[PDB]
Design an enzyme around this catalytic site. Structure first.
Site, PDB file in Angstrom:
ATOM      1  N   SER A  20      19.402 -15.867 -32.636  1.00  0.00           N
ATOM      2  CA  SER A  20      19.160 -17.292 -32.369  1.00  0.00           C
ATOM      3  C   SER A  20      19.327 -17.708 -30.908  1.00  0.00           C
ATOM      4  O   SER A  20      18.951 -18.840 -30.552  1.00  0.00           O
ATOM      5  CB  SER A  20      20.085 -18.155 -33.257  1.00  0.00           C
ATOM      6  OG  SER A  20      19.617 -18.234 -34.606  1.00  0.00           O
ATOM      7  N   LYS A  62      16.336 -19.189 -29.279  1.00  0.00           N
ATOM      8  CA  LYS A  62      15.944 -20.577 -29.474  1.00  0.00           C
ATOM      9  C   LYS A  62      15.922 -21.324 -28.144  1.00  0.00           C
ATOM     10  O   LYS A  62      15.064 -22.185 -27.938  1.00  0.00           O
ATOM     11  CB  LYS A  62      16.864 -21.205 -30.510  1.00  0.00           C
ATOM     12  CG  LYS A  62      16.501 -20.672 -31.890  1.00  0.00           C
ATOM     13  CD  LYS A  62      17.434 -21.138 -33.024  1.00  0.00           C
ATOM     14  CE  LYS A  62      16.883 -20.677 -34.397  1.00  0.00           C
ATOM     15  NZ  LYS A  62      17.682 -19.703 -35.099  1.00  0.00           N
ATOM     16  N   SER A 104      20.937 -24.523 -34.931  1.00  0.00           N
ATOM     17  CA  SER A 104      20.369 -23.202 -35.142  1.00  0.00           C
ATOM     18  C   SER A 104      19.415 -23.201 -36.334  1.00  0.00           C
ATOM     19  O   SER A 104      19.305 -22.202 -37.049  1.00  0.00           O
ATOM     20  CB  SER A 104      21.483 -22.167 -35.329  1.00  0.00           C
ATOM     21  OG  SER A 104      21.117 -20.941 -34.728  1.00  0.00           O
ATOM     22  N   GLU A 112      11.054 -16.424 -37.244  1.00  0.00           N
ATOM     23  CA  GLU A 112      12.170 -16.422 -38.181  1.00  0.00           C
ATOM     24  C   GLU A 112      11.661 -16.186 -39.593  1.00  0.00           C
ATOM     25  O   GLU A 112      10.656 -16.773 -39.995  1.00  0.00           O
ATOM     26  CB  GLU A 112      12.918 -17.732 -38.207  1.00  0.00           C
ATOM     27  CG  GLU A 112      13.436 -18.152 -36.924  1.00  0.00           C
ATOM     28  CD  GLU A 112      14.699 -17.413 -36.584  1.00  0.00           C
ATOM     29  OE1 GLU A 112      15.251 -17.735 -35.517  1.00  0.00           O
ATOM     30  OE2 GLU A 112      15.131 -16.535 -37.384  1.00  0.00           O
ATOM     31  N   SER A 170      23.314 -14.730 -34.300  1.00  0.00           N
ATOM     32  CA  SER A 170      23.834 -13.669 -35.132  1.00  0.00           C
ATOM     33  C   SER A 170      22.705 -13.147 -35.969  1.00  0.00           C
ATOM     34  O   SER A 170      21.689 -13.821 -36.193  1.00  0.00           O
ATOM     35  CB  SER A 170      24.980 -14.156 -36.007  1.00  0.00           C
ATOM     36  OG  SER A 170      24.554 -15.183 -36.875  1.00  0.00           O
TER      37      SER A 170
END
Ligand SMILES: [Cl-]
Length: 260
Positions: free
Chosen positions: A42, A45, A102, A138, A209
């Protein structure tokens, strides 16, 4: 001696630790496995959000444009997008959701808007970052398979890029300020780099993570009465089902800021 303590930390943790610190006071660096590749998870992002902000310098109403959220858009972790199903969210809202919560749908919506993972990667290249690569959407970008180059970067490259984005002039004033504001509002990183820093320091960070117990945090840090720091901490482990180790990131942060 800092290197010794990071090697001993990495040894104790049982995984592979990548650290890059830029101290903007004297333009010095602390580097540890800083040229190795690590799965971003993440923390990528930040690059998608900046890509959208960059687009907005030429399309001023861009951040107010509405994107529909449907059930078909949900993935594995959508803390904000799930509350908006069958409605719309602005890109600014999606940017904030990705950075501060997130939210993975938000990330996928940013990726889509700028033309997919290859366009986010092309944006990073434009900034002088030739290491960053985003390959997937994702949730698959988080598999973090050892040896797999997909969706990886190095600590050194992400520290230098984050410096450009947050302290430099890669973005316009309005946009850089927006990015820093979102990151200072992050809700997910109190247990990572922040946990190894004095309470009085100000942090804007993005955690990450994924697979192989990968645990990451990237941060711009404003110490009290000191020039800002940029700190990248990436950590990954040998076991596929390994648990997240935010404490390793907190220990690394403590180690490399001791003396500042
Ligand atoms: Cl303290």
């Amino acid at each position: 001696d800092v290197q010794q303590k990071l090697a001993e930390l990495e040894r104790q943790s049982g995984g592979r630790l990548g650290v890059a610190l830029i101290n903007t006071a004297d333009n010095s660096q602390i580097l540890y496995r800083a040229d190795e590749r690590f799965a971003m998870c993440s923390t990528s992002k930040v690059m998608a959000a900046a890509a959208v902000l960059k687009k907005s310098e030429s399309e001023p109403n861009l951040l107010n444009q509405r994107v529909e959220i449907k059930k078909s858009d949900l993935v594995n972790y959508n803390p904000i997008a799930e509350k908006h199903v069958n409605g719309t969210m602005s890109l600014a809202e999606l940017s904030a959701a990705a950075l501060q919560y997130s939210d993975n749908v938000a990330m996928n919506k940013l990726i889509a808007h700028v033309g997919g993972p290859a366009s986010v990667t092309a944006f990073a290249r434009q900034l002088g970052d030739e290491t960053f690569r985003l390959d997937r959407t994702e949730p698959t970008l988080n598999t973090a398979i050892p040896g797999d180059p997909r969706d990886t970067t190095s600590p050194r490259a992400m520290a230098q890029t984050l410096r450009n984005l947050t302290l430099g002039k890669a973005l316009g004033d309005s946009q850089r300020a927006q990015l820093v504001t979102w990151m200072k509002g992050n809700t997910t990183g109190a247990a990572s780099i922040q946990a190894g820093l004095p309470a009085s320091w100000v942090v804007g960070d993005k955690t990450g993570s994924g697979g192989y117990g990968t645990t990451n945090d990237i941060a711009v840090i404003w110490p009290k009465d000191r020039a800002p720091l940029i700190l990248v901490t990436y950590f990954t482990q040998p076991q596929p089902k390994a648990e997240s180790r935010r404490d390793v990131l907190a220990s690394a942060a403590k180690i490399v800021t001791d003396g500042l």
